[PDB]
Paper text:
The T-cell receptor (TCR) recognizes peptides bound to major histocompatibility molecules (MHC) and allows T-cells to interrogate the cellular proteome for internal anomalies from the cell surface. Here we explored these issues using phage display to generate a high affinity TCR derived from the MEL5 TCR specific for the heteroclitic version of the HLA-A*0201-restricted primary melanoma antigen recognized by T-cells 1 (MART-126–35) peptide, ELAGIGILTV (A2-ELA). This TCR, α24β17, bound to A2-ELA with an affinity 30,000 times stronger than the natural parent MEL5 TCR, resulting in picomolar levels of binding. Remarkably, although the enhanced affinity was mediated primarily through new TCR-MHC contacts, α24β17 remained acutely sensitive to modifications at every position along the peptide backbone, mimicking the specificity of the wild type TCR.
Additionally, we solved the structure of the unligated α24β17 TCR and unligated A2-ELA1A, A2-ELA4A, and A2-ELA8A molecules. The structure of the unligated α24β17 TCR demonstrated that a large 8.06 Å conformational shift in CDR3β loop was required to accommodate residues toward the C terminus of the peptide. Together with the observation of a favorable entropy change for binding, these observations indicated that, similar to the MEL5-A2-ELA complex (TΔS° ∼ 8.3 kcal/mol), an entropically favorable transition from order to disorder was key for driving the high affinity interaction, probably through the expulsion of ordered solvent during binding rather than a loss of order at the TCR-pMHC interface.
Numbering used by the authors:
A (entry chain E): 1 to 244
B (entry chain D): 1 to 200
Write the structure that this text describes.
């Protein structure tokens, strides 16, 4: 079969820094390759379209360039990022061979360009134990996890129970909300729920963990503030069941 | 974007109903037509494509194309909560895909045995906040945001893809205020008169 991969998935970089997005496709030869950019609440806009007959480019001036060093590798670059370059970048391909085929996108690249890296904050994470009233009325126990005060707005929250990630009974906000709606550079918050049976919650041997991956600064980014360099990291909170 | 338009407001239907997405394209010589689905935070996924006038049916989805009026539509039958997404129309001309700006669709789950209740959870010692959970209400209930900008409320969440358990609706409200109680957390929302409020 054929697939397509792009990386990095999510980038947080300062203005004036270089950009390099990668994209590879497998299972075909001489594919059409595309780079798109998508704004929130809008459809993907074509940046570059390369193929056997040439390069087609967006009619609107871009601060980006494309390269194809190998048949199945497509790269999106910039020597010097602008604040206006923040966005969601998408790579895609289509079959040039007999018959249709492809028209699939990679996983995308979330790019956040920052004017000032001191605005970056990792999340604080807390888990809240189920209500005894819920347990009585329903025989179910809902735990809640709150990830608060982070910036930029992208984190990945997962729940772990006894060393294994769980998906059943999990409901997580699709996107973070702004703690300060009227303020431009507001920090963010995200919530999730894990619902298990009362009987499972009431065993104190059961260990629950809310885990949040945050993407921020990399090792090479400079930092002189007292607080810990807000680097890409995992922040989590945990709880153990209780008999009561 | 004017070559491909999806001029429609946000759609919403109850689970099991039929939904219909519309799209118009400008070039009559366009060769093929596509529908993608896109969830929050993800890249778009291909649903179907079609190059012939008429209907192309695939499972619960039907792509309809009229090359005279230059309209493309996606018909979704027996809608599922997991069909909740942004739908994108795209048109191929010589290999160049042009996309519309998308249309959102929400499919409300059918809650067979509601039990609207507001509970107070307790922090695991390391926060200072208290959290209130409004859960088990049926989908005809809308959770409004709080007037107090010091109280946060997250209306709807998304059930994990690999979840094998049923889905119930819930809203979370939190604040660090001393006068914050679950008894008033959701006062700006219209909740069922039969909502269970346990008394601590």
């Amino acid at each position: 079969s054929q697939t397509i991969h792009q990386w990095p998935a999510t980038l947080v970089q300062p203005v004036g820094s270089p950009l390099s997005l990668e994209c590879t496709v497998e299972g075909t030869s001489n594919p059409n390759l595309y780079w798109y950019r998508q704004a929130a609440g809008r459809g993907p806009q074509l940046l570059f379209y390369w193929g056997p007959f040439g390069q087609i480019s967006s009619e609107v001036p871009q601060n980006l360039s494309a390269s194809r060093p190998q048949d199945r590798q497509f790269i999106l670059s910039s020597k010097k990022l602008l604040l206006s370059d923040s966005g969601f970048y998408l790579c895609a391909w289509s079959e040039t061979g007999l018959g249709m085929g492809g028209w699939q996108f990679g996983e995308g690249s979330r790019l956040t360009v920052l004017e000032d890296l001191k605005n970056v904050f990792p999340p604080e994470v807390a888990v809240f134990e189920p209500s005894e009233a819920e347990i009585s009325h329903t025989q179910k126990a809902t735990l809640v996890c709150l990830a608060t005060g982070f910036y930029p707005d992208h984190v990945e929250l997962s729940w772990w129970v006894n060393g294994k990630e769980v998906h059943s009974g999990v409901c997580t906000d699709p996107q973070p909300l702004k703690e300060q709606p009227a303020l431009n550079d507001s920090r963010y918050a995200l919530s999730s729920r894990l619902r298990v049976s009362a009987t499972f919650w009431q065993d104190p041997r059961n260990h629950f963990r809310c885990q949040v991956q945050f993407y921020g600064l990399s090792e090479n980014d400079e930092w002189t503030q007292d607080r810990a360099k807000p680097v890409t990291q995992i922040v989590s909170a945990e709880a153990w069941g209780r008999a009561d | 974007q004017k070559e491909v338009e999806q001029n429609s407001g946000p759609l919403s239907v109850p689970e099991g109903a039929i939904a219909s997405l519309n799209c118009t394209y400008s070039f009559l010589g366009s060769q093929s037509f596509f529908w993608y689905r896109q969830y929050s935070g993800k890249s778009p996924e291909l649903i179907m494509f079609t190059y012939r006038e008429g209907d192309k049916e695939d499972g619960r989805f039907t792509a309809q194309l009229n090359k005279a009026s230059q309209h493309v539509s996606l018909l979704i039958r027996d809608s599922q909560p997991s069909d909740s997404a942004t739908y994108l129309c795209a048109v191929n001309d010589g290999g160049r895909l042009t996309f519309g700006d998308g249309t959102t669709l929400t499919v409300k789950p059918n809650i067979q045995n509601p039990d609207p209740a507001v509970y107070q959870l307790r922090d695991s010692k390391s926060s200072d906040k208290s959290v209130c959970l409004f859960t088990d209400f049926d989908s005809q209930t809308n959770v409004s945001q709080s007037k107090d900008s010091d109280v946060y409320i997250t209306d709807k969440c998304v059930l994990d893809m690999r979840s094998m358990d049923f889905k119930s609706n819930s809203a979370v409200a939190w604040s660090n205020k001393s006068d914050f109680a679950c008894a008033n957390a959701f006062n700006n929302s219209i909740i069922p008169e039969d909502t269970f409020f346990p008394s601590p």
